[PDB]
Amino acid sequence: AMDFIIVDDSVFDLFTQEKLLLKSGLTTSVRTFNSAQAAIDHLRSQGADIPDTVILLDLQMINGFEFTEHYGMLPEAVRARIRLFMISSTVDISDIEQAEANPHIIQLLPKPLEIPLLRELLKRWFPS
Amino acid sequence: AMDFIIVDDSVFDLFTQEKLLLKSGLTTSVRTFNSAQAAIDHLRSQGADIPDTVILLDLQMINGFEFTEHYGMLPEAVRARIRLFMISSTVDISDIEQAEANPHIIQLLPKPLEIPLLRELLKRWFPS
Amino acid sequence: AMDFIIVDDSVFDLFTQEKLLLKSGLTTSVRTFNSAQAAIDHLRSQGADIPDTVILLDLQMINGFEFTEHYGMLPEAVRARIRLFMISSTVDISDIEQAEANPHIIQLLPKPLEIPLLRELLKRWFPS
Protein backbone atom coordinates (compact mmCIF):
# COMPACT_ATOMS: atom_id res chain seq x y z
CA ALA A 1 0.00 0.00 0.00
CA MET A 2 1.84 3.06 -1.30
CA ASP A 3 1.00 6.69 -1.96
CA PHE A 4 2.49 8.46 -4.96
CA ILE A 5 3.36 12.14 -5.19
CA ILE A 6 4.33 13.58 -8.56
CA VAL A 7 6.03 16.98 -8.79
CA ASP A 8 6.35 18.32 -12.34
CA ASP A 9 6.08 21.79 -13.88
CA SER A 10 4.90 20.17 -17.12
CA VAL A 11 1.12 19.81 -16.89
CA PHE A 12 1.09 17.32 -19.76
CA ASP A 13 3.77 15.15 -18.15
CA LEU A 14 2.08 15.48 -14.75
CA PHE A 15 -1.33 14.12 -15.80
CA THR A 16 0.17 11.58 -18.21
CA GLN A 17 2.37 10.10 -15.49
CA GLU A 18 -0.59 10.04 -13.10
CA LYS A 19 -2.58 8.15 -15.72
CA LEU A 20 0.09 5.47 -16.20
CA LEU A 21 0.60 4.88 -12.47
CA LEU A 22 -3.15 4.47 -12.00
CA LYS A 23 -3.31 2.25 -15.10
CA SER A 24 -1.05 -0.24 -13.33
CA GLY A 25 -1.77 -1.87 -9.98
CA LEU A 26 1.25 -0.06 -8.59
CA THR A 27 -0.86 2.44 -6.65
CA THR A 28 -4.40 3.75 -6.19
CA SER A 29 -3.63 7.15 -4.67
CA VAL A 30 -1.76 9.63 -6.85
CA ARG A 31 -1.29 13.21 -5.68
CA THR A 32 -0.08 15.72 -8.29
CA PHE A 33 1.72 19.03 -7.81
CA ASN A 34 2.54 21.62 -10.45
CA SER A 35 4.92 23.50 -8.14
CA ALA A 36 7.60 22.66 -5.58
CA GLN A 37 6.06 25.13 -3.13
CA ALA A 38 2.67 23.39 -3.14
CA ALA A 39 4.45 20.04 -2.88
CA ILE A 40 6.53 21.24 0.06
CA ASP A 41 3.46 22.80 1.71
CA HIS A 42 1.63 19.47 1.56
CA LEU A 43 4.62 17.61 3.01
CA ARG A 44 4.95 20.08 5.90
CA SER A 45 1.44 19.13 7.04
CA GLN A 46 2.26 15.42 7.18
CA GLY A 47 3.33 13.39 10.20
CA ALA A 48 5.13 10.08 10.67
CA ASP A 49 1.75 8.35 10.37
CA ILE A 50 1.69 8.68 6.58
CA PRO A 51 1.75 5.56 4.35
CA ASP A 52 4.78 4.40 2.38
CA THR A 53 5.14 7.31 -0.02
CA VAL A 54 6.96 7.56 -3.34
CA ILE A 55 7.82 11.02 -4.66
CA LEU A 56 8.58 11.52 -8.36
CA LEU A 57 10.38 14.82 -8.81
CA ASP A 58 11.13 16.37 -12.20
CA LEU A 59 14.71 17.53 -12.78
CA GLN A 60 14.39 20.53 -15.12
CA MET A 61 11.96 22.57 -13.04
CA ILE A 62 12.32 26.02 -7.64
CA ASN A 63 14.05 23.19 -9.51
CA GLY A 64 15.00 19.69 -8.37
CA PHE A 65 18.09 20.57 -6.35
CA GLU A 66 16.30 23.47 -4.70
CA PHE A 67 13.35 21.24 -3.83
CA THR A 68 15.65 18.83 -2.00
CA GLU A 69 16.98 21.68 0.13
CA HIS A 70 13.48 22.41 1.41
CA TYR A 71 12.84 18.67 1.55
CA GLY A 72 15.86 18.17 3.80
CA MET A 73 14.22 20.58 6.24
CA LEU A 74 11.31 18.19 6.85
CA PRO A 75 11.47 16.14 10.07
CA GLU A 76 13.48 12.93 9.72
CA ALA A 77 10.49 10.93 10.97
CA VAL A 78 8.45 11.84 7.88
CA ARG A 79 11.40 11.50 5.47
CA ALA A 80 11.84 7.92 6.69
CA ARG A 81 8.38 7.12 5.29
CA ILE A 82 9.33 8.50 1.89
CA ARG A 83 11.42 7.35 -1.07
CA LEU A 84 12.30 10.25 -3.38
CA PHE A 85 13.20 9.75 -7.05
CA MET A 86 14.38 12.20 -9.70
CA ILE A 87 12.82 11.97 -13.17
CA SER A 88 13.91 13.59 -16.43
CA SER A 89 13.76 13.29 -20.22
CA THR A 90 17.37 14.41 -20.64
CA VAL A 91 20.10 12.53 -18.77
CA ASP A 92 23.71 13.71 -19.06
CA ILE A 93 26.39 12.13 -16.85
CA SER A 94 26.56 15.39 -14.87
CA ASP A 95 22.97 14.98 -13.69
CA ILE A 96 23.62 11.37 -12.65
CA GLU A 97 26.62 12.38 -10.52
CA GLN A 98 24.66 15.10 -8.70
CA ALA A 99 21.69 12.83 -7.98
CA GLU A 100 24.16 10.24 -6.70
CA ALA A 101 25.71 12.86 -4.42
CA ASN A 102 22.33 14.04 -3.13
CA PRO A 103 21.33 11.93 -0.08
CA HIS A 104 17.59 12.46 -0.58
CA ILE A 105 17.64 11.48 -4.25
CA ILE A 106 17.65 7.69 -4.33
CA GLN A 107 17.96 7.31 -8.09
CA LEU A 108 17.53 9.27 -11.31
CA LEU A 109 14.86 7.72 -13.53
CA PRO A 110 14.43 8.45 -17.25
CA LYS A 111 11.29 9.79 -18.95
CA PRO A 112 8.94 8.28 -19.73
CA LEU A 113 8.67 6.24 -16.54
CA GLU A 114 9.24 2.49 -16.92
CA ILE A 115 6.64 0.91 -14.64
CA PRO A 116 8.27 -2.53 -14.45
CA LEU A 117 11.61 -0.86 -13.68
CA LEU A 118 10.06 1.16 -10.86
CA ARG A 119 7.97 -1.70 -9.47
CA GLU A 120 11.13 -3.78 -9.06
CA LEU A 121 12.92 -0.79 -7.55
CA LEU A 122 10.11 -0.43 -5.00
CA LYS A 123 10.86 -3.95 -3.74
CA ARG A 124 14.32 -2.71 -2.75
CA TRP A 125 13.26 0.47 -0.95
CA PHE A 126 9.87 -0.53 0.45
CA PRO A 127 10.57 -4.17 1.44
CA SER A 128 8.47 -6.98 2.95
CA ALA B 1 4.46 4.37 26.33
CA MET B 2 6.55 7.53 26.00
CA ASP B 3 9.42 9.12 27.87
CA PHE B 4 9.56 12.89 28.26
CA ILE B 5 12.69 15.01 28.47
CA ILE B 6 12.36 18.68 29.38
CA VAL B 7 15.26 21.07 28.81
CA ASP B 8 14.75 24.52 30.34
CA ASP B 9 17.07 27.01 32.06
CA SER B 10 14.10 28.27 34.07
CA VAL B 11 13.85 26.12 37.19
CA PHE B 12 10.29 27.29 37.84
CA ASP B 13 9.17 26.45 34.29
CA LEU B 14 11.07 23.14 34.42
CA PHE B 15 9.34 21.74 37.52
CA THR B 16 5.98 23.28 36.62
CA GLN B 17 5.98 21.64 33.20
CA GLU B 18 7.05 18.34 34.76
CA LYS B 19 4.12 18.62 37.16
CA LEU B 20 1.56 19.18 34.39
CA LEU B 21 2.82 16.30 32.23
CA LEU B 22 2.64 13.95 35.22
CA LYS B 23 -0.78 15.35 36.13
CA SER B 24 -2.11 14.05 32.82
CA GLY B 25 -1.95 10.45 31.65
CA LEU B 26 0.33 11.58 28.84
CA THR B 27 3.43 10.09 30.47
CA THR B 28 4.77 8.56 33.68
CA SER B 29 8.49 9.17 33.18
CA VAL B 30 9.65 12.78 33.05
CA ARG B 31 13.36 13.58 33.00
CA THR B 32 14.33 17.21 33.64
CA PHE B 33 17.49 19.07 32.65
CA ASN B 34 18.52 22.58 33.66
CA SER B 35 21.29 22.73 31.05
CA ALA B 36 21.80 21.71 27.43
CA GLN B 37 25.12 20.08 28.33
CA ALA B 38 23.56 17.73 30.89
CA ALA B 39 20.75 17.01 28.43
CA ILE B 40 23.23 16.25 25.64
CA ASP B 41 25.35 14.13 28.01
CA HIS B 42 22.34 11.98 28.88
CA LEU B 43 21.42 11.54 25.21
CA ARG B 44 24.97 10.49 24.29
CA SER B 45 24.65 7.53 26.65
CA GLN B 46 21.45 6.28 24.99
CA GLY B 47 21.12 3.63 22.30
CA ALA B 48 18.44 2.78 19.74
CA ASP B 49 16.75 0.66 22.41
CA ILE B 50 15.24 3.69 24.15
CA PRO B 51 11.44 4.15 24.29
CA ASP B 52 9.51 6.66 22.20
CA THR B 53 10.93 9.89 23.58
CA VAL B 54 9.59 13.43 23.45
CA ILE B 55 12.01 16.30 24.08
CA LEU B 56 10.69 19.72 25.09
CA LEU B 57 13.40 22.31 24.49
CA ASP B 58 13.15 25.93 25.63
CA LEU B 59 13.94 28.58 23.03
CA GLN B 60 15.45 31.48 25.00
CA MET B 61 18.21 29.53 26.74
CA ILE B 62 23.82 26.96 24.97
CA ASN B 63 20.46 28.08 23.57
CA GLY B 64 17.93 26.21 21.43
CA PHE B 65 19.70 26.51 18.08
CA GLU B 66 23.02 25.57 19.64
CA PHE B 67 21.45 22.55 21.32
CA THR B 68 20.22 21.26 17.97
CA GLU B 69 23.75 21.43 16.58
CA HIS B 70 24.97 19.05 19.28
CA TYR B 71 21.73 17.09 18.89
CA GLY B 72 22.40 16.61 15.18
CA MET B 73 25.66 14.92 16.16
CA LEU B 74 23.82 12.06 17.88
CA PRO B 75 23.56 8.81 15.89
CA GLU B 76 20.58 8.73 13.51
CA ALA B 77 19.39 5.50 15.13
CA VAL B 78 18.70 7.27 18.43
CA ARG B 79 17.28 10.41 16.79
CA ALA B 80 14.72 8.21 15.03
CA ARG B 81 13.32 7.28 18.46
CA ILE B 82 12.92 10.94 19.39
CA ARG B 83 10.52 13.76 18.54
CA LEU B 84 11.98 17.16 19.44
CA PHE B 85 9.80 20.23 20.08
CA MET B 86 10.71 23.85 20.75
CA ILE B 87 8.84 25.68 23.52
CA SER B 88 8.72 29.39 24.32
CA SER B 89 6.65 32.11 25.99
CA THR B 90 7.48 34.65 23.27
CA VAL B 91 6.74 33.76 19.65
CA ASP B 92 7.67 36.21 16.89
CA ILE B 93 7.36 35.16 13.24
CA SER B 94 11.17 35.05 13.03
CA ASP B 95 11.33 32.23 15.58
CA ILE B 96 8.67 30.26 13.71
CA GLU B 97 10.60 30.48 10.43
CA GLN B 98 13.83 29.25 12.02
CA ALA B 99 12.15 26.33 13.78
CA GLU B 100 10.50 25.46 10.46
CA ALA B 101 13.91 25.54 8.76
CA ASN B 102 15.53 23.39 11.46
CA PRO B 103 15.11 19.68 10.55
CA HIS B 104 15.31 18.47 14.15
CA ILE B 105 12.70 20.92 15.42
CA ILE B 106 9.32 19.43 14.54
CA GLN B 107 7.21 22.33 15.77
CA LEU B 108 7.40 25.41 17.97
CA LEU B 109 4.95 25.19 20.88
CA PRO B 110 3.81 28.16 23.00
CA LYS B 111 4.16 28.50 26.78
CA PRO B 112 2.43 27.35 28.80
CA LEU B 113 2.15 23.90 27.20
CA GLU B 114 -1.32 22.94 25.98
CA ILE B 115 -1.64 19.26 26.91
CA PRO B 116 -4.57 18.49 24.59
CA LEU B 117 -2.70 20.20 21.74
CA LEU B 118 0.41 18.11 22.39
CA ARG B 119 -1.47 14.84 22.95
CA GLU B 120 -3.07 15.19 19.52
CA LEU B 121 0.29 16.13 18.03
CA LEU B 122 1.80 12.95 19.49
CA LYS B 123 -0.69 10.89 17.47
CA ARG B 124 0.91 12.31 14.32
CA TRP B 125 4.54 11.72 15.25
CA PHE B 126 4.30 8.58 17.38
CA PRO B 127 1.58 6.66 15.48
CA SER B 128 -0.19 3.32 16.01
CA ALA C 1 20.88 -11.99 12.36
CA MET C 2 23.51 -9.41 11.42
CA ASP C 3 25.84 -8.81 8.50
CA PHE C 4 29.34 -7.49 9.11
CA ILE C 5 31.33 -5.26 6.79
CA ILE C 6 34.98 -4.61 7.56
CA VAL C 7 36.84 -1.78 5.84
CA ASP C 8 40.60 -1.79 6.46
CA ASP C 9 43.63 -0.96 4.30
CA SER C 10 45.67 -3.44 6.35
CA VAL C 11 45.26 -6.85 4.74
CA PHE C 12 46.57 -8.59 7.86
CA ASP C 13 44.12 -6.74 10.13
CA LEU C 14 41.30 -7.29 7.63
CA PHE C 15 41.52 -11.09 7.50
CA THR C 16 42.42 -11.40 11.19
CA GLN C 17 39.34 -9.43 12.24
CA GLU C 18 37.20 -11.48 9.86
CA LYS C 19 38.55 -14.64 11.48
CA LEU C 20 37.70 -13.51 15.02
CA LEU C 21 34.16 -12.42 14.14
CA LEU C 22 33.51 -15.77 12.48
CA LYS C 23 35.14 -17.56 15.42
CA SER C 24 32.41 -16.18 17.68
CA GLY C 25 28.69 -16.69 17.17
CA LEU C 26 28.37 -12.95 16.63
CA THR C 27 27.87 -13.32 12.88
CA THR C 28 28.06 -15.78 9.99
CA SER C 29 28.39 -13.35 7.09
CA VAL C 30 31.52 -11.19 6.99
CA ARG C 31 32.23 -9.02 3.95
CA THR C 32 35.74 -7.55 3.70
CA PHE C 33 36.94 -4.49 1.79
CA ASN C 34 40.51 -3.32 1.30
CA SER C 35 39.43 0.09 0.01
CA ALA C 36 36.81 2.71 0.85
CA GLN C 37 35.84 2.95 -2.82
CA ALA C 38 34.98 -0.74 -3.09
CA ALA C 39 33.14 -0.50 0.24
CA ILE C 40 31.17 2.53 -0.94
CA ASP C 41 30.46 0.86 -4.30
CA HIS C 42 28.95 -2.16 -2.55
CA LEU C 43 26.81 0.05 -0.30
CA ARG C 44 25.49 2.05 -3.26
CA SER C 45 24.00 -1.15 -4.68
CA GLN C 46 22.08 -1.93 -1.49
CA GLY C 47 18.46 -1.11 -0.69
CA ALA C 48 16.47 -0.78 2.53
CA ASP C 49 15.86 -4.54 2.38
CA ILE C 50 19.34 -5.36 3.69
CA PRO C 51 19.78 -7.12 7.06
CA ASP C 52 20.97 -5.40 10.24
CA THR C 53 24.48 -4.46 9.17
CA VAL C 54 27.52 -3.54 11.25
CA ILE C 55 30.37 -1.68 9.55
CA LEU C 56 33.85 -1.68 11.08
CA LEU C 57 35.86 1.16 9.58
CA ASP C 58 39.58 1.65 10.18
CA LEU C 59 40.69 5.14 11.22
CA GLN C 60 44.19 5.54 9.75
CA MET C 61 43.33 4.73 6.14
CA ILE C 62 40.28 7.76 1.37
CA ASN C 63 40.56 7.67 5.17
CA GLY C 64 37.88 7.33 7.84
CA PHE C 65 36.57 10.89 7.78
CA GLU C 66 36.51 10.90 3.99
CA PHE C 67 34.64 7.60 3.94
CA THR C 68 31.90 9.07 6.12
CA GLU C 69 31.43 11.92 3.66
CA HIS C 70 30.63 9.44 0.89
CA TYR C 71 28.69 7.37 3.41
CA GLY C 72 26.50 10.36 4.29
CA MET C 73 25.52 10.49 0.61
CA LEU C 74 23.80 7.09 0.82
CA PRO C 75 19.99 7.15 1.12
CA GLU C 76 18.76 7.51 4.70
CA ALA C 77 16.67 4.35 4.30
CA VAL C 78 19.80 2.21 3.93
CA ARG C 79 21.77 4.08 6.61
CA ALA C 80 18.98 3.29 9.07
CA ARG C 81 19.77 -0.42 8.63
CA ILE C 82 23.43 0.18 9.45
CA ARG C 83 25.49 0.84 12.58
CA LEU C 84 28.92 2.25 11.73
CA PHE C 85 31.89 1.96 14.10
CA MET C 86 35.41 3.38 13.89
CA ILE C 87 38.32 1.09 14.79
CA SER C 88 41.96 1.94 15.43
CA SER C 89 45.13 0.78 17.19
CA THR C 90 46.08 4.32 18.22
CA VAL C 91 43.56 6.39 20.18
CA ASP C 92 44.42 9.98 21.11
CA ILE C 93 41.75 12.22 22.67
CA SER C 94 41.59 14.18 19.40
CA ASP C 95 40.32 11.13 17.51
CA ILE C 96 37.68 10.47 20.17
CA GLU C 97 36.33 14.02 19.91
CA GLN C 98 36.03 13.85 16.12
CA ALA C 99 34.28 10.48 16.15
CA GLU C 100 31.93 11.89 18.79
CA ALA C 101 31.22 14.88 16.55
CA ASN C 102 30.63 12.69 13.48
CA PRO C 103 26.93 11.67 13.34
CA HIS C 104 27.58 8.48 11.36
CA ILE C 105 30.32 7.25 13.69
CA ILE C 106 28.56 5.68 16.66
CA GLN C 107 31.67 4.90 18.68
CA LEU C 108 35.43 4.57 18.32
CA LEU C 109 36.59 1.04 19.18
CA PRO C 110 40.20 0.08 19.99
CA LYS C 111 42.30 -2.53 18.17
CA PRO C 112 42.24 -5.40 18.56
CA LEU C 113 38.45 -5.72 18.66
CA GLU C 114 36.98 -6.86 21.98
CA ILE C 115 34.19 -9.25 21.00
CA PRO C 116 32.37 -9.19 24.35
CA LEU C 117 32.54 -5.38 24.32
CA LEU C 118 31.04 -5.24 20.84
CA ARG C 119 28.41 -7.93 21.47
CA GLU C 120 27.07 -5.92 24.40
CA LEU C 121 27.22 -2.75 22.31
CA LEU C 122 25.14 -4.46 19.62
CA LYS C 123 22.34 -4.95 22.16
CA ARG C 124 22.11 -1.16 22.42
CA TRP C 125 22.06 -0.36 18.72
CA PHE C 126 20.32 -3.42 17.28
CA PRO C 127 17.70 -4.07 20.00
CA SER C 128 14.99 -6.71 20.53
Shape annotation of chain A: globular
Largest sheet of chain A: 5 strands, parallel
Report the CATH topology name of chain A: Rossmann fold
CATH architecture of chain A: 3-Layer(aba) Sandwich
N-end to C-end Cα span of chain A: 11 Å
* CATH class descriptor of chain A: Alpha Beta
The CATH superfamily of chain A bears the name Response regulator
Q: Provide the structure class of chain A.
A: alpha/beta
The total number of structural domains of chain A is 1
State the helicity of chain A in percent bands: 40-55%
Keywords (chains A, B, C): Phosphoprotein
Pfam families (chains A, B, C): Response_reg
Protein name (chains A, B, C): Response regulator receiver protein
InterPro entries (chains A, B, C): CheY-like_superfamily (IPR011006), Sig_transdc_resp-reg_receiver (IPR001789)
